[PDB]
Amino acid sequence: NVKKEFPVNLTIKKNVYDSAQDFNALQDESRNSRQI
Amino acid sequence: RTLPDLLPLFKTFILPLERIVEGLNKSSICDSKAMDSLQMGLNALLILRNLAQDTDSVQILVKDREIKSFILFILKKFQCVATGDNKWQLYEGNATFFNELTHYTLDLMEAISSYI
Amino acid sequence: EEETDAEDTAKLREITKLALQLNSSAQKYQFFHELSLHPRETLTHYLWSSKQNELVLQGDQYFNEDAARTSDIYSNNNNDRSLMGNISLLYSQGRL
Amino acid sequence: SNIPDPTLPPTEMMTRFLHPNWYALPTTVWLKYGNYNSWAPSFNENGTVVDSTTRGLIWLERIGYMD
Amino acid sequence: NNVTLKNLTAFQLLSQRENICELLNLVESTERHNSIINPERQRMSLEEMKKMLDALKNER
Amino acid sequence: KRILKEVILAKKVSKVPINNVRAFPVLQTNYNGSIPVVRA
Amino acid sequence: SEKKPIKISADFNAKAKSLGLESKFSNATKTALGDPDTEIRISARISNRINELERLPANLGTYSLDDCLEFITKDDLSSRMDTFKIKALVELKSLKLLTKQKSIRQKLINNVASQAHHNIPYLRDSPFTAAAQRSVQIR
Amino acid sequence: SKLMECVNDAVQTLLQGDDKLGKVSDKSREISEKYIEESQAIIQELVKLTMEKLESKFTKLCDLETQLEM
Amino acid sequence: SKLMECVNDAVQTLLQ
Amino acid sequence: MGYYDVLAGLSALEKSSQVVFSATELQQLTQKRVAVHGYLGGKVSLADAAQVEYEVGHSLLGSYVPRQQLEALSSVDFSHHFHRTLECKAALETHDVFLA
Amino acid sequence: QTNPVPVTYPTDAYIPTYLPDDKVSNLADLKKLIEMDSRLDLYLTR
């Protein structure tokens, strides 16, 4: 006498529709034939 | 017996139960303090009955005018309910409480029935 | 014998059902008579009992695998913290 | 660690959870003494939560009028 | 057929609320009140009583 | 994407919201340890 | 609207509903997470996210654009090279320790529910819970 | 379940006033009369059912008398 | 809304 | 599998001009739940769990690696392993199909 | 049999004794009928 959400790490994820726009670190050097 | 001055506390919790039961023929448990006092009385009564299931405890209980008078009061209220007297008519909203009460009392009576 | 037993049982059950209906009507009459005798006390009792019963009926709502699987009820932003506050004790008892 | 993969069943928490607010309290017993034994104790209400008439009214409302 | 704390509290609260709502005349219970009275059943029972009374009267 | 691009390019908006993570991921050189293995 | 807005009948399921108490006679409510279809779908999404996280490179430094004030001379080490790597690791490991969190959560919930009638006042003080706890202790 | 909040507020306002309880008492009195009428009807039907029961048991009595004579 | 209207009308009829 | 996949494979390796498609080659290139663990309930028999087939798939080193073994692995070998299995797989599959 | 076989439906019910004797005028007849039924049961069972 607010709802704190899990972080949306957008920088980590990849583009779903056009994956030719991801950062060069995330891309796969296999569509332009540069693996070997 | 081994713990004297234990019965006085239970009597302090049990006699206001007598007053309440007399006032139990109408809606009179509106407040939470009333409900708390009623529940404390019922718990003390059950404790007394469980102890009275033993020889030394019932011997100590018999030598007490207050407990015997309370048992007689509850029995006369039960008789008034049974014979259908117009003096004191139990309000059904309280019946539950009364029910438990009666049972405990009878058990007590059973025990002390050997000493009268 | 079986027919007689079944018939007697059915008749007894019908009579008991009618007796229970009589009890219900009599209890409603008694409530309204008591209200006519002492309105203030019965109305205060009604208000208190309704509040208490509503409080009781809302004691198990966050126990439905939806509140359990999402992080809402475990958040500290809850004004009432009757769930997380136990942790310490539960840890000292080793049960957890 | 011994912790399994999060995609392996089971995955539900409250599958066998019971809150005390549904624990099947004790009530009247409703004994039955033959057919022509009417001067017989019908109930047995020793450690009940609610008395006989209220239990009967509950049964009447929920079961007796189910038809 | 089973009775738990939730069921008991719900039943008691429902009875209380029904009674109070009836006090304020906020409820119309003609169906229940005429299925319990059942005036057809009243007439049937009255005619049965009359027939039984005539039977007892004429046996003498 | 094309609609928004042509809307912004034509200057058909008063202001453009600018909220960007001020970092961006990039690869990193990856060398080996020079202390040889004992291999018991 | 004009007449009585309740109109109680002899059903007890419409009567109970019209006065508010509708779900109060069922044991447990109905939820969405109780079906195996939604469980399979959630598991699929979680597995896909974990796949994507694990297909990332290990050497995943980050240029922070505030390294300007830290005059790095090609020999110093940037104090923020591991910020996206730390977040990736945190998310991956948190996604891999889901069942452990579930188990601890359900232990907490069970051990706090079993003591409802002893720790919560408005449940401990109802006449029915008191009557039941007394009935158990009848010698 | 929203109507009951208004009902509770109305009952509280009733408890606030002083000269409001007499009308409540009179209305409850009339309602009690309604319910005693209902109980009278139920009691009459109970009487009918017990009459039927007694008739059946009376036939049983006649059979028992025949057995005793045998 | 209309709920308060009905409740207050009932209370006024009760008190009059 | 796919025409553009075949082209990407033949271009990864530098032997793209040493391949010639036929008519048919071109026309064909254009086209309950048993409780396994017991962290949440009462575990079912281990025999029942073995009867079911497990498939993690999403992880790379499976669902479990012991502490000592993982702590004492070689990173160069596994980097080359992942480069062979994850990235260079299409080229090797094409080299398995074509190029004798 | 040596026990009364607990059952699931209510086997009896009290009759309320708090009703006004003036308004309800057929309770006495119902209680008389109940007593006669009990007597018939006793006689048959004996």
Tab-separated table of N, CA, C and O in Angstrom, chain E residues 1 5 7-9 13-14 21-26 31 34-35 39 42-43 45-46 48-50 55-57 59:
chain	number	residue	atom	x	y	z
E	1	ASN	N	-21.573	-35.964	-17.981
E	1	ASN	CA	-21.696	-37.002	-16.965
E	1	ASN	C	-20.570	-36.883	-15.947
E	1	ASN	O	-20.642	-37.441	-14.855
E	5	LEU	N	-14.268	-28.724	-11.761
E	5	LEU	CA	-14.404	-27.380	-11.214
E	5	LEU	C	-14.964	-26.415	-12.251
E	5	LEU	O	-15.836	-25.591	-11.943
E	7	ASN	N	-16.878	-27.085	-14.896
E	7	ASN	CA	-18.294	-27.358	-15.118
E	7	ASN	C	-19.150	-26.820	-13.982
E	7	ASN	O	-20.201	-26.218	-14.221
E	8	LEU	N	-18.723	-27.038	-12.740
E	8	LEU	CA	-19.509	-26.588	-11.597
E	8	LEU	C	-19.634	-25.073	-11.579
E	8	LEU	O	-20.731	-24.529	-11.397
E	9	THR	N	-18.512	-24.372	-11.744
E	9	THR	CA	-18.560	-22.917	-11.735
E	9	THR	C	-19.401	-22.392	-12.889
E	9	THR	O	-20.182	-21.451	-12.717
E	13	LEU	N	-22.752	-20.147	-12.317
E	13	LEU	CA	-22.790	-18.817	-12.907
E	13	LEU	C	-23.926	-18.693	-13.908
E	13	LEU	O	-24.574	-17.646	-13.993
E	14	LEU	N	-24.186	-19.752	-14.673
E	14	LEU	CA	-25.290	-19.723	-15.621
E	14	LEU	C	-26.620	-19.577	-14.902
E	14	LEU	O	-27.478	-18.795	-15.324
E	21	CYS	N	-31.034	-11.917	-15.139
E	21	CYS	CA	-31.617	-11.465	-16.397
E	21	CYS	C	-33.131	-11.602	-16.392
E	21	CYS	O	-33.823	-10.838	-17.071
E	22	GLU	N	-33.665	-12.563	-15.638
E	22	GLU	CA	-35.112	-12.649	-15.508
E	22	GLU	C	-35.661	-11.543	-14.622
E	22	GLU	O	-36.778	-11.066	-14.849
E	23	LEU	N	-34.897	-11.123	-13.612
E	23	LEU	CA	-35.356	-10.028	-12.764
E	23	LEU	C	-35.552	-8.750	-13.569
E	23	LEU	O	-36.553	-8.047	-13.397
E	24	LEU	N	-34.609	-8.434	-14.454
E	24	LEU	CA	-34.712	-7.246	-15.290
E	24	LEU	C	-35.634	-7.438	-16.484
E	24	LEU	O	-35.742	-6.526	-17.308
E	25	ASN	N	-36.283	-8.596	-16.600
E	25	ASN	CA	-37.202	-8.884	-17.699
E	25	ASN	C	-36.492	-8.803	-19.048
E	25	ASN	O	-37.035	-8.297	-20.029
E	26	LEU	N	-35.258	-9.303	-19.097
E	26	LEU	CA	-34.468	-9.328	-20.319
E	26	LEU	C	-34.477	-10.693	-20.993
E	26	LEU	O	-33.596	-10.975	-21.810
E	31	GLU	N	-41.131	-20.905	-24.116
E	31	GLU	CA	-40.972	-22.284	-24.568
E	31	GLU	C	-40.689	-23.216	-23.399
E	31	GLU	O	-41.336	-24.257	-23.249
E	34	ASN	N	-43.715	-23.423	-20.922
E	34	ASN	CA	-44.855	-24.160	-21.441
E	34	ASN	C	-44.512	-25.588	-21.839
E	34	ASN	O	-45.424	-26.369	-22.124
E	35	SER	N	-43.231	-25.943	-21.878
E	35	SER	CA	-42.854	-27.346	-21.968
E	35	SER	C	-42.806	-28.004	-20.599
E	35	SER	O	-42.963	-29.226	-20.498
E	39	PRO	N	-49.626	-27.563	-20.999
E	39	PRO	CA	-51.079	-27.599	-20.754
E	39	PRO	C	-51.791	-28.779	-21.397
E	39	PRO	O	-52.809	-29.238	-20.862
E	42	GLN	N	-51.392	-31.280	-18.946
E	42	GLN	CA	-52.300	-30.969	-17.848
E	42	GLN	C	-53.695	-31.517	-18.118
E	42	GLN	O	-54.306	-32.145	-17.247
E	43	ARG	N	-54.217	-31.283	-19.322
E	43	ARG	CA	-55.548	-31.787	-19.652
E	43	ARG	C	-55.576	-33.310	-19.644
E	43	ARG	O	-56.531	-33.921	-19.144
E	45	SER	N	-53.644	-35.378	-17.907
E	45	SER	CA	-53.589	-35.836	-16.526
E	45	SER	C	-54.910	-35.597	-15.811
E	45	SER	O	-55.339	-36.425	-15.002
E	46	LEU	N	-55.575	-34.477	-16.097
E	46	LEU	CA	-56.854	-34.207	-15.451
E	46	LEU	C	-57.904	-35.228	-15.865
E	46	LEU	O	-58.673	-35.717	-15.028
E	48	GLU	N	-57.296	-38.264	-16.897
E	48	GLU	CA	-56.920	-39.526	-16.265
E	48	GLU	C	-57.365	-39.567	-14.808
E	48	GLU	O	-57.874	-40.590	-14.334
E	49	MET	N	-57.168	-38.465	-14.081
E	49	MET	CA	-57.646	-38.389	-12.706
E	49	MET	C	-59.153	-38.577	-12.642
E	49	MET	O	-59.659	-39.295	-11.771
E	50	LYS	N	-59.886	-37.934	-13.551
E	50	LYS	CA	-61.339	-38.076	-13.555
E	50	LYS	C	-61.752	-39.520	-13.805
E	50	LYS	O	-62.659	-40.037	-13.142
E	55	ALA	N	-63.821	-44.660	-11.687
E	55	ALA	CA	-63.621	-46.083	-11.443
E	55	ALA	C	-63.746	-46.407	-9.961
E	55	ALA	O	-64.451	-47.346	-9.576
E	56	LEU	N	-63.069	-45.635	-9.110
E	56	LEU	CA	-63.179	-45.867	-7.673
E	56	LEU	C	-64.589	-45.602	-7.163
E	56	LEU	O	-65.017	-46.214	-6.178
E	57	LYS	N	-65.324	-44.697	-7.811
E	57	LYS	CA	-66.677	-44.390	-7.361
E	57	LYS	C	-67.644	-45.518	-7.691
E	57	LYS	O	-68.543	-45.823	-6.899
E	59	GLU	N	-67.014	-48.814	-8.238
E	59	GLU	CA	-66.741	-50.154	-7.732
E	59	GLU	C	-67.551	-50.483	-6.486
E	59	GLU	O	-67.733	-51.664	-6.176
